Amino acid sequence: MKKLFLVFWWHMHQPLYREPYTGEYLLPWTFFHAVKDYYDMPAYLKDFEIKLNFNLTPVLIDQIQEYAQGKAKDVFLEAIRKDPDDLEKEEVEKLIEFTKLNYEKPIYRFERIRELMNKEKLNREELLDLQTLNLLAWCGRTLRKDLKDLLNKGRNYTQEEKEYVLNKYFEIIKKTLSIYREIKEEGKGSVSTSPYYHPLIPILLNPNCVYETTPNVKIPDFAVSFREDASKHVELAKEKYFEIFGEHPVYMWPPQASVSNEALELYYEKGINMLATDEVILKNSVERASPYLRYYFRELISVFFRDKTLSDLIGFSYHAWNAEDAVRDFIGRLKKIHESVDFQPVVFVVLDGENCWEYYEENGIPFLEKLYSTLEKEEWIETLTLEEAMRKEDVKTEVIESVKAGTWFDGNFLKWIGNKEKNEYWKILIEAKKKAKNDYILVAEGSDWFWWQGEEKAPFVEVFDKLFRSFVRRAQE
Template sequence: MSLKLSFLWHMHQPDYVDEGGEMHMPWVFLHAIKDYYEMPWLLSKFPALKATFNLTPTLIRQIRLYEENGYKKDKFLMLWIREVSTLKEEEKKYLIKLCKSAPFETMVKPLQRFAVLYHKEHFGEAELQDLEVLFLLAWCGNYLRENSAVVQSLLQKATAYTQSDKETLLEALLKFIPQILPFYGSLLQSGQISLSTTPYNHPILPLLIDMQTAAVSNPQTVLPQNPLSLEGDAGRQVDKAIELYVKVFGQKPTGLWPAEGAVDEKSLHLYREKGIEWVATDEAILQKTLKSSEKNLCYHRYEYDSVFIAFRDHPLSDSIGFRYRFMEETDAVGDFMKRLDEIGKQHSDANVFVIVDGENAWEFYRNNAMDFFLKLYEAVSKSRTVTMQRFDDLPKEGRQKLPSLHPGSWIYGTFDTWVGQSEKNRAWELIYQTKRETDSAYRKLDKKTQTAVEEHFLASECSDWFWWYGEDHFSDFLAEFDTLFRSHLIAVYELCGMPVPSNLYLNIFRERNVALSQVKPQFPLSVEVDGTETSFYEWLGAGMVDESKAFSTMDGVKRVVQKLYYGENDTVMYFRLDVNVKQFLSAYKEIKLHFKELPDAIVLPVTDRYGKDGLTLVCKDMVEFAIDKKYCQKKSTLHLQLEITDKQNSSEFVPTFGEIEVCLNDYSKNWFI
């Protein structure tokens, strides 16, 4: 058995820079001190192992802004570094909002003082100063914690930080950032990694070329009104990405990760013309291309229009991105290696492509996932059957030529995450409006101003804006994303010397609050477990988690559970899952209830009807199940998270945000008074 394992770690942030050159969000800086150096550093501890990293142009450009300007182009850091006493109330609110954005369990809780401050609503000056410093320290990755004397000293100090401490910390972190890109360059030259790029502003390139492609991918998709072909912009997005890569790394890229794995035949042809030899996307594209749901197809090598296409193993990739953070590191690595072993036994020459967001998952792991990666890389290095391979080293022989290529992305093989809902379509329509109305004035501009206009158009085409618009994802920073998107189109009118249309000053996104997606139980329940809503009153007073409104950037894949209802009475706990029951029964095999206070998970099979030893389940119009309270071991409070496992052994956790608290027979704290 011989298996070739190819990792691609995708490093990306959208363009947070406004027309004045200021970054409105600090995520590039925060991931720079936590992930962008640390991920290749962890790999470098195993010199015989190889991997591929994708660095997007928007990320590279913003890292270089910090190299050139320090904190002076970052809105957050310019406020953070000021004396707390000089801050206005609105500035304090902005800082506090960002400082409370870190995941509590993995980043806040390990720092005792941070955990105390996290739950406060009002801050004195000394408390706010501590909050600011602890927030940045929490974002410092393991490399900095092991190698920076400043970070080590301030972590040990733990509280009572001074303005001098803030200045010393920021100076040390800003000196660290210029080491990041050269480190990738050195690993590229040594041959341990290959590097790839993405079209310049991370656009959904097939939709720029032809918006009708979205309807070809999914005929049910509602298209924006009066679409324009932005094929010229698509070519510029690729040209500028290659140009920047050459400038930074001294050579042309051979490979490219299309933003969001979005591909179609026209974009592949464009990539080939630009000298790109390989791209990658999701296995769903291959299955739709070949009109087959056969899982093992993705372990072969394919090409279309002379461009090699790597099709990611979806369950394996998502296990690292979403599932393993809930497991002990040894168990997670054991599961990963077991799956590779099973694949290898079925295929004598398997190529397994694991493609994962290289930055956003790790803050949900313990210790920024370092323990997981060290165990994973050690296991692979000791394996006699698994070899890690760079994408640049993929053999050209033995490739199967695809006669066609289904258009779509890494999410369900469609483009619906970026077009189809009213907010997403409105954003596209504003781009088309701006293109049409400024075209004549643009042609009369000097070359320098034309270039500035083009930059704003390319920035407005970034996939991230369309990701956040609509009902499928939530962020506490929707208003900031919305403002940034519209600011690029406003700047185009201003550069063209034209009045700005009033509709560009109106919010695209509708106000929504993720807190409304969770309701706690109000009253005891009496449910007939029959898989139907027997009466309106049956689930009245139940707790509810609306997963469809609580999705975040970490949950790109559409989730099977839309809503979870839960409640109890004196003897039984009740649960209800709102799902597509037909899909649920065909694709999923079991439900595990993980109670933090209980030693073992409670397991229910996914089937039409089940009843045994105090456990009852029925799937009909919905999934309803009941659990006898004898399993609660007389606990008064339990913390629960459901794990729903499909037949490919990929799991979805509900709720997405973590555990729900179940206070048995005590509803008083949940009543609205």
């Protein structure tokens, strides 16, 4: 039987939201995505006989452990936790703006939220509901079955009921990293990591990588070298992986799929057997390649290229469709790949594993449950782990010699460098690295800080600029 080999690689990352001096988490994005996706995505493998693979960044690992140890001083979560009678006006405005940002996401479709937002003034019992419903909107698949009745109530929540939800939420956080260990040991999937603080390795190694796809951009004069710090990102991530899993990582996802001939060399010298990047880089780098093949880079390392179409469909398109339609579309495009090639194709599906689900109905649980059940019965599709895909001899392999540096965002680095605003953050980093006396410089080399800068008016970009400038300052002391 000619088979199609499907590889799912779910990338999970949250930049360090913890302000260095105050030790306060200024955004609750780690807590809400952990209680909703970080435990629940692998928990699918307990109920579906398929293979899924996950990528965890070290900085995400650090935050979840702090939240699981009760040490994270989340300011927003404290506004949820407290009785509304102890709530200052600023915290109440913070709660209402958080609800306004998510008001139109399907996971916030609670009738009570319609009322309370249309309400001009709010009493304590209404504020308790704005807190509790805000927590309950971010409920993952596991606890959605457990707290079904609280979720069915929809209103008239109490302080004790909200605190019960919160303890149940923290139990999931305490169980999160064990499930990644469990699915790795059980063979139900492979776990990978990225360089520690999600940096852009091609830029740190040689900033001239931006001109390979964007020749007339203006980048800041890099008067300092970041090549040593680039190795530290890879090297420290292997130790965090060894801490959690007891072995060194052999598979790594380059942050934002960023690859260069130099990064690939570095990943080879630090022991990475395989990495993955986007189809755009393949089309820029090699003449008429297919993304359905294992690739050897100069015999040193193995590179797989993701399917941009299928991955973006889940990441951006399928949320609008009914669940049955999206799954049928997905299998339809897989059936066309099967007939497009005269070999047994490998189809790599890589995307962020947490951010798309909030825009889906019921946090995407129906779509995922129909996709995993469909994939269970379709026998021309075999889901694989990254390790199984590495050892499989039914996957055609070709050797390539070069790549053109880029990312999965248009094949260029323009989302992080190129304009005056983005270049401001690099000039700050370069000048600070000249004076950097601690490793908080590595936090400031994270990709997220540069992403939010100057693109458009966006949510809580203030908070990102505060942390960047805080990490930079603490890096020079």
